[PDB]
Amino acid sequence: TRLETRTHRPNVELCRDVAQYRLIKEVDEIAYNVARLKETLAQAQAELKGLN
Amino acid sequence: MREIVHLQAGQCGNQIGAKFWEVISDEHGIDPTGTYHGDSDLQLERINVYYNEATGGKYVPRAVLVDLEPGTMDSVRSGPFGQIFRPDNFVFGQSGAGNNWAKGHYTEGAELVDSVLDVVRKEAESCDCLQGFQLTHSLGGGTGSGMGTLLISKIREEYPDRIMNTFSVVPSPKVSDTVVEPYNATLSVHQLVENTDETYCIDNEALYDICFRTLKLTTPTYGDLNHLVSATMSGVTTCLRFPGQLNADLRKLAVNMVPFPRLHFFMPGFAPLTSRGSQQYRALTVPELTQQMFDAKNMMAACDPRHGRYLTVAAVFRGRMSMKEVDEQMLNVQNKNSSYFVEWIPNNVKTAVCDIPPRGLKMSATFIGNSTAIQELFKRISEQFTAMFRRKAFLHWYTGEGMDEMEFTEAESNMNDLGNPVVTRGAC
Amino acid sequence: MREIVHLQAGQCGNQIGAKFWEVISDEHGIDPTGTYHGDSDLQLERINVYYNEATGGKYVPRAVLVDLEPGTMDSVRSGPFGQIFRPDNFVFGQSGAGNNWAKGHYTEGAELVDSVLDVVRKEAESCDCLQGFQLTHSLGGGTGSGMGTLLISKIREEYPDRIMNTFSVVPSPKVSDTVVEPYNATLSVHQLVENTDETYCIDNEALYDICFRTLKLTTPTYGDLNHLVSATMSGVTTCLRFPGQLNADLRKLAVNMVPFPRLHFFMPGFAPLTSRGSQQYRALTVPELTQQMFDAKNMMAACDPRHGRYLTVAAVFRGRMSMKEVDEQMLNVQNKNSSYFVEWIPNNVKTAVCDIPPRGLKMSATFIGNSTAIQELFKRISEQFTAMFRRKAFLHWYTGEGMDEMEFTEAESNMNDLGNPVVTRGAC
Amino acid sequence: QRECISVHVGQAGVQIGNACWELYCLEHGIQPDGQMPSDDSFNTFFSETGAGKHVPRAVFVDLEPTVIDEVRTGTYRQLFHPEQLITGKEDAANNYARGHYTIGKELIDLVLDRIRKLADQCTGLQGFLIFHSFGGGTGSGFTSLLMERLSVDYGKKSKLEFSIYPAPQVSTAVVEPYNSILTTHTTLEHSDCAFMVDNEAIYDICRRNLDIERPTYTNLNRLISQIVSSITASLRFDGALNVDLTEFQTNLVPYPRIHFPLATYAPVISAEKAYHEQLSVAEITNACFEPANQMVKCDPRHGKYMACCLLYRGDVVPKDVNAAIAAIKTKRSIQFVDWCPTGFKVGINYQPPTVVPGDLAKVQRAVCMLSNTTAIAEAWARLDHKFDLMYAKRAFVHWYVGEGMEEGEFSEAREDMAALEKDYEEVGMDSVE
Amino acid sequence: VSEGFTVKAMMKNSVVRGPPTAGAFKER
Amino acid sequence: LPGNSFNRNIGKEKFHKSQHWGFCNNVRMLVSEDKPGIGGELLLGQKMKPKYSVFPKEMGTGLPSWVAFDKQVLSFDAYLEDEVPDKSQENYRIRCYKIYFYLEDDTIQVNEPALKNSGLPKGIFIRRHRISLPPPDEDQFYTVYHFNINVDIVLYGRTFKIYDCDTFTKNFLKKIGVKLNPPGQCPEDPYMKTRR
Amino acid sequence: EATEQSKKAAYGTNQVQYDVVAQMLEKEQAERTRRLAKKVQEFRE
Amino acid sequence: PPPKFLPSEWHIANKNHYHRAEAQRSRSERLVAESQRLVDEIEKTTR
Numbered sequence A: 001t002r003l004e005t006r007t008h009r010p011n012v013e014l015c016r017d018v019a020q021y022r023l024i025k026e027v028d029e030i031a032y033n034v035a036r037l038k039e040t041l042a043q044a045q046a047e048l049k050g051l052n
Numbered sequence B, C: 001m002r003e004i005v006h007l008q009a010g011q012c013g014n015q016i017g018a019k020f021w022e023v024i025s026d027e028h029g030i031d032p033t034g035t036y037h038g039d040s041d042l043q044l045e046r047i048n049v050y051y052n053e054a055t056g057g058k059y060v061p062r063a064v065l066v067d068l069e070p071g072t073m074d075s076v077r078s079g080p081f082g083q084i085f086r087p088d089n090f091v092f093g094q095s096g097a098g099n100n101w102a103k104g105h106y107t108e109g110a111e112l113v114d115s116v117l118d119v120v121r122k123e124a125e126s127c128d129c130l131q132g133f134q135l136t137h138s139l140g141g142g143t144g145s146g147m148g149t150l151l152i153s154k155i156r157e158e159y160p161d162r163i164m165n166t167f168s169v170v171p172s173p174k175v176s177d178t179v180v181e182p183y184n185a186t187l188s189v190h191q192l193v194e195n196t197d198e199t200y201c202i203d204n205e206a207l208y209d210i211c212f213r214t215l216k217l218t219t220p221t222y223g224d225l226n227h228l229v230s231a232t233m234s235g236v237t238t239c240l241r242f243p244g245q246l247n248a249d250l251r252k253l254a255v256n257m258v259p260f261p262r263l264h265f266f267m268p269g270f271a272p273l274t275s276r277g278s279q280q281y282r283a284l285t286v287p288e289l290t291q292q293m294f295d296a297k298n299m300m301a302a303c304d305p306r307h308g309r310y311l312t313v314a315a316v317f318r319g320r321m322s323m324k325e326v327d328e329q330m331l332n333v334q335n336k337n338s339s340y341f342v343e344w345i346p347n348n349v350k351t352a353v354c355d356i357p358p359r360g361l362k363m364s365a366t367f368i369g370n371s372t373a374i375q376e377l378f379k380r381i382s383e384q385f386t387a388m389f390r391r392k393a394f395l396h397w398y399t400g401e402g403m404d405e406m407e408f409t410e411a412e413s414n415m416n417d418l419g420n421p422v423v424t425r426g427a428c
Numbered sequence D: 001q002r003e004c005i006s007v008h009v010g011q012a013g014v015q016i017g018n019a020c021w022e023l024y025c026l027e028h029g030i031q032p033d034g035q036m037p038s039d040d041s042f043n044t045f046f047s048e049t050g051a052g053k054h055v056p057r058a059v060f061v062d063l064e065p066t067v068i069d070e071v072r073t074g075t076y077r078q079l080f081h082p083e084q085l086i087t088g089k090e091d092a093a094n095n096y097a098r099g100h101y102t103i104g105k106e107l108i109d110l111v112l113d114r115i116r117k118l119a120d121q122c123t124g125l126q127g128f129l130i131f132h133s134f135g136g137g138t139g140s141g142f143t144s145l146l147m148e149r150l151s152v153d154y155g156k157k158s159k160l161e162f163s164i165y166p167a168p169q170v171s172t173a174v175v176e177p178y179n180s181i182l183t184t185h186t187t188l189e190h191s192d193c194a195f196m197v198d199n200e201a202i203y204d205i206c207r208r209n210l211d212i213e214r215p216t217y218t219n220l221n222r223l224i225s226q227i228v229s230s231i232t233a234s235l236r237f238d239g240a241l242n243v244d245l246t247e248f249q250t251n252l253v254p255y256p257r258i259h260f261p262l263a264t265y266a267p268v269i270s271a272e273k274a275y276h277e278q279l280s281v282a283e284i285t286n287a288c289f290e291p292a293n294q295m296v297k298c299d300p301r302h303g304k305y306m307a308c309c310l311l312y313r314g315d316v317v318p319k320d321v322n323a324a325i326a327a328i329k330t331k332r333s334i335q336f337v338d339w340c341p342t343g344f345k346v347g348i349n350y351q352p353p354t355v356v357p358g359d360l361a362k363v364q365r366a367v368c369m370l371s372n373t374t375a376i377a378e379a380w381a382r383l384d385h386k387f388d389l390m391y392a393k394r395a396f397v398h399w400y401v402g403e404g405m406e407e408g409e410f411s412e413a414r415e416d417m418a419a420l421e422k423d424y425e426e427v428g429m430d431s432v433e
Numbered sequence E: 001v002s003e004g005f006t007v008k009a010m011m012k013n014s015v016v017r018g019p020p021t022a023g024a025f026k027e028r
Numbered sequence F: 001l002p003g004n005s006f007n008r009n010i011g012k013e014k015f016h017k018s019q020h021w022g023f024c025n026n027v028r029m030l031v032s033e034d035k036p037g038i039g040g041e042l043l044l045g046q047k048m049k050p051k052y053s054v055f056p057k058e059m060g061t062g063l064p065s066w067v068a069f070d071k072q073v074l075s076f077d078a079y080l081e082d083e084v085p086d087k088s089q090e091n092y093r094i095r096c097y098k099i100y101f102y103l104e105d106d107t108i109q110v111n112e113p114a115l116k117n118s119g120l121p122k123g124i125f126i127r128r129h130r131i132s133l134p135p136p137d138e139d140q141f142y143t144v145y146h147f148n149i150n151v152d153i154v155l156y157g158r159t160f161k162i163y164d165c166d167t168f169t170k171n172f173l174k175k176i177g178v179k180l181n182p183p184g185q186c187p188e189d190p191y192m193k194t195r196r
Numbered sequence G: 001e002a003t004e005q006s007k008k009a010a011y012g013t014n015q016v017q018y019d020v021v022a023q024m025l026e027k028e029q030a031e032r033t034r035r036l037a038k039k040v041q042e043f044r045e
Numbered sequence H: 001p002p003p004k005f006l007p008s009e010w011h012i013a014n015k016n017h018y019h020r021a022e023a024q025r026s027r028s029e030r031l032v033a034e035s036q037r038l039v040d041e042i043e044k045t046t047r
């Protein structure tokens, strides 16, 4: 939502500031961490099958 | 509007057409259920060239599936894109060809051909302005040879001015699957001479060579061989399926590639072909596509083009690309290899370009070649036929189902009759 | 736009060029996957000398890998920069050289050289302006001695006006890694004399003596030795990849350093080399850089330059340096060592500087030397060769593979003939 | 693409081979049965079936049940293909002749058929590693018949042979002298590079180094196995300077006939002792030249070297070697024939030597040398004298002349062998010109 | 000399082999 | 930064070499693409390991899947819907299907069972082949773990709703360790209701 | 001239940094080898 | 009938069941600790 709001800046003010790349790396970092949760959840599910 | 009715004969034609319809459904955005889940409106812009409409906005192919045994219809239906055809179009008979051209032409095929022409008639009347028919069949063997020639004869009698595109699998010299392949090919090329408008000869040994030497696979199957058939089968007809600068439909290719009415046997080619490991390391451009088309290994027929002068050449490109580079490459090929092109046809290369490339690629280039080198194939079938026919083995089925020795003699004399003009055009 | 085709033969050539591609990918900014992650646009401006562009922006080296035994092919792939190479450029066979020049030149090398030449032509016509071929191989042993010389011969016959470079690891004076390496070195030098335009004679013990007396390592690796080779490999071809004042490419070095066509055997040298203790006792400037250049311990061949007068010296510096110091230092070396430079070639030293220093270093400089002192290597090879060829030992497996006595006779006569200019130029 | 069919002919061959496979199976992880527990390096000695059974590329062959009937009911009863082990019914009874001209013509066809099979199932044979035993029937006779046929059918293809050469003072059989001279008279033109080992020497080494004062035959085969793991290593593991089978010939066999390289391992220390040793690349190179670690009873200082092949394995920096080889080249007790300016074929595989739960200690570095020293002539001489001491009063000749061989051969043999004897002396002579 | 449509054909002064003759105007 | 002497040694004890360059069918390729480097380490690039099914120690005698896991298939029952003028009978069908999972090669099959006064295309619905996953992830295939009571399995754009398997599948999946869901009943087809 | 002095200063400091990095890493490899040897010794008891 | 087993196989089977249950529980507590680590690490780095 922050990036979608910052998209609507005017002509010159629409800039590549330090927080813009920080927000892009934030989105990529959250995707990476979420994927690591899904991998750990899949491992936990298969291990629950083994414990059963 | 221009539209084509798709006919499949025999197990080979049925599997080739099933792979073809998988490829066309993927290209035009149709799911295995039938519903359009696409990305661009150009897929729906010209979808009424192979797909009939419906209610519910999801489309049904205009394919008639002919076979003399009721198992390959079940296999095609059980396939992935198999429950997309018209169940009325599943025409089949409770009999067996037995790889007998006599049994595919003068018996039970001759009693199934009435229902075949009925469903063909219904599909052709449910149309606006027919371009023609395309039959997929194997030249050697039963069914698709005998049924193939019988349907082509009846359809050419019924519709005299519509195109006939027959993709025929010619028997290979190195390997074989039917004893009477010389008999069946010899008996079938005669009807393929005066009937079909474009016959494309595809050799299984050449498909072997392309799948192992260029594509460099380990375990290729008939699915992959029929896919190599289907890529060219779609690239020939992509110009009336998608927009493009300098388009060329089937007749605009046929006039430019058939200089004399019987010299319409072609060597097809597809050439953005790369091994899987080396796919990422490619620098795909128009000169590289031209190199791969004209190189004498991507031919899908077992006829080396260096053994005969090219009569006519067709190159149907796909993808956003510069026409100057295309003219560059065709002029350079003609200039550098001038003895392999005929001199009484100045600029014997026809060029077409389409805008939309196949999915997963950037530029495509399908190749059609009418050359002198088909004399090797036609003579090769003639000596195999004379070797099996001098002692008259495997002939009593044909004579008992109702043939005569002069029919086989006429067939071999007419393949020699077809071999002669290909020679006299290659030698001025 | 000048481009170079890289070629590597044998285990020694394969590992040297693998380290060379690692070093030059570090210099140009290419990751192991092939994408470009650089720092300045000067790396990408002339990246089209060693890297063919591809789709997706990944750059593929213009190198052909030749080895009769596909074991070092696996080693190169399993190394760090193994995914960067084209999978089609690995040309290998189902045989082994056995350290036999006969088995690398008159046998299965001949049935594999056609595929090598096809790959070479594919990498040479996908160009606009070719400059030269460079080959890395070992002078003593199989494959690289045999296939290296055969491939140089075939490429020189096909492309007669292009620079041919050969980085050859010569046999040692002290310890042999191949018993028949006098035979291999004689039979390879006989081809290398009347084929190539530049030859870099590199000795393992000389690279090693640089590795300890100058660098003060304790446990080197052959990876470190090929790094020392690759530094000179990159430093020779650096003005054609990076800007500067007084640029000099391969041919501009060749015209200056080859006075007569046979005397093109050079001694490479690369010497901003500071050790783990003496790096911080150092006052790095152009005069001491020239001192380490012209010191007779940074030679990469085991041949003492004080034993023979220099015919020609060239130095390709890299870095932002004033040229008064460079010009004055080379003049001072030529003046203060009068007995080591022949007087009939005034200012026999070529100076060429670039502006982009090797990553990490502020000011670097390569050194290439054609000297009278190359005669000792050929004389040691000749004397070991006549000591072995005298009693006809280790020769029955050359005659059995199909060579003759007269080929050894001609090679020995040619190399002893080559011993005559490289003593007459030292004796005026 | 690097495959090597290994033929073991004779009790020795099988017993020596049954000790090389324990190793090849641990050096590649392949379990006793043949199912790599839980990557493609095994394709030099083990084939992969659909089931996943890593099947060996060998043909254990003997003419008497016993020997092989223990590899078919041992801990490897499910690794070897039941048809790879080709046995017979009646042994050749220490009669080179019986196992070449009588009971040999009965198994040769089936043995050759399985080698044809094994070959096809390979994309690039590096050679046939044979394991005979100059002494008994098979080891003498069959090995000969194989060599001949395995030379026609499959040509050039290297045929490197490993032989248990007779001893200088021990010897088990009384007819040994005969068998040995006969097998050389018939396998001097159909071999390639015959490596050699004598039980007395390995026995001595096992007492002077491993401290085993009572060594058996298994304490011996295990070492012959680590020697082969060295020769065949650059084809399986990684290294700087590799060395394929085809190279151990064009570097060790000078003149055609002189194809009898000797063998010597380097760090044959034994646990406790290694605690006090640095086992450096020079402390193992020099050892390989020591006239005691030599695995064939022969002081090489009383002759002249012709070509050494040092194959190191483990932690061995490119320098250590160069420096060590140079130090050996400066020594006066290591002279080399004039016609060998260069006399070293070096190789450096990186895989550290493996450790079978047995004796030889776990080493971080090791070397195995192959020397064609001329001191092997004293051996051929002694052997010839014993053959002569008996062939005078035509001893044990009825036995051989009855099975089929023509007496003529007995003579012809010693005749040609004398030429080989002369050959050795000459290669040593220098030239004042 | 270049055989056919190979890479050796499209390189500067590359002479190309002609195709073989055929059975027309030839005795049988 | 890489200079002429800037390197490290390694303490590995594993130096296996994999034959990444070979021949099959007398042409030169990469043979495979999924073989590790030196010491069994995966190359930069390739990252795959399960691929096929990862079955537990049931029949873990070392025999492969095509021997120990012999002609034993897992059966399931499902249904679907669509509308295009050439039918079985009527709107809103619960067309019954029998799905088999063949264990010897990890494949699946969909088949048409029998209904009484019914003119369906009768027989095979999907041929035996290894069907991919619904594509967020169109590179993995269907293992045994993605099959259960009362679930939605997506095959070729068709959401088969599996409700009751059969006794052997219950026993086998109970052994493999997946908790089977409580069974459900297929809703009745309206024309089958009018016919019955 | 001051910028030039500064530039040379940067270059030299960076070179000395590289050298110290190398030396420390080597000290590490030295310890690593001793450990490997002592670990090998562990397998001999 | 099923084959009449031996007293040796009875103890071996019981011990192997014991070991399999214990090893599964050990790997299970390993994943419990790793799950706690992942959740805590990602919460802190997100903040």
Ligand SMILES: Nc1nc2c(ncn2[C@@H]2O[C@H](COP(=O)(O)OP(=O)(O)OP(=O)(O)O)[C@@H](O)[C@H]2O)c(=O)[nH]1
Binding pocket: D009, D010, D011, D012, D013, D015, D016, D019, D064, D091, D092, D093, D094, D095, D132, D133, D134, D135, D136, D137, D138, D139, D140, D164, D172, D199, D217, D218, D219, D220, D221, D222
């Ligand atoms: N490591 C090892 N070497 C063995 C073993 N058995 C025999 N040898 C060697 O084999 C030699 C004697 O065996 P052979 O000469 O091959 O006997 P043979 O060829 O089977 O002849 P027959 O007596 O007819 O059966 C001995 O001198 C040993 O060197 C063994 O079990 N282990």
Ligand SMILES: Nc1nc2c(ncn2[C@@H]2O[C@H](COP(=O)(O)OP(=O)(O)O)[C@@H](O)[C@H]2O)c(=O)[nH]1
Binding pocket: B009, B010, B011, B012, B013, B015, B016, B097, B099, B138, B139, B140, B141, B142, B143, B144, B145, B169, B176, B177, B178, B204, B222, B223, B225, B226, B229
């Ligand atoms: N391209 C392709 N060719 C096929 C396929 N299946 C069979 N063929 C070829 O078809 C040839 C014979 O088919 P044929 O006997 O005529 O089948 P029929 O028409 O049903 O009698 C064989 O030699 C096969 O090589 C396929 O799936 N794709």
Ligand SMILES: Nc1nc2c(ncn2[C@@H]2O[C@H](COP(=O)(O)OP(=O)(O)O)[C@@H](O)[C@H]2O)c(=O)[nH]1
Binding pocket: C009, C010, C011, C012, C013, C015, C016, C097, C099, C138, C139, C140, C141, C142, C143, C144, C145, C169, C177, C178, C204, C222, C223, C225, C226, C229, D240, D241
């Ligand atoms: N600088 C350098 N030299 C090497 C390397 N590998 C091998 N050599 C040299 O190459 C020589 C042997 O190579 P050779 O047997 O001729 O290789 P072949 O061409 O495959 O026969 C040895 O004397 C080594 O000194 C390396 O990685 N770097």
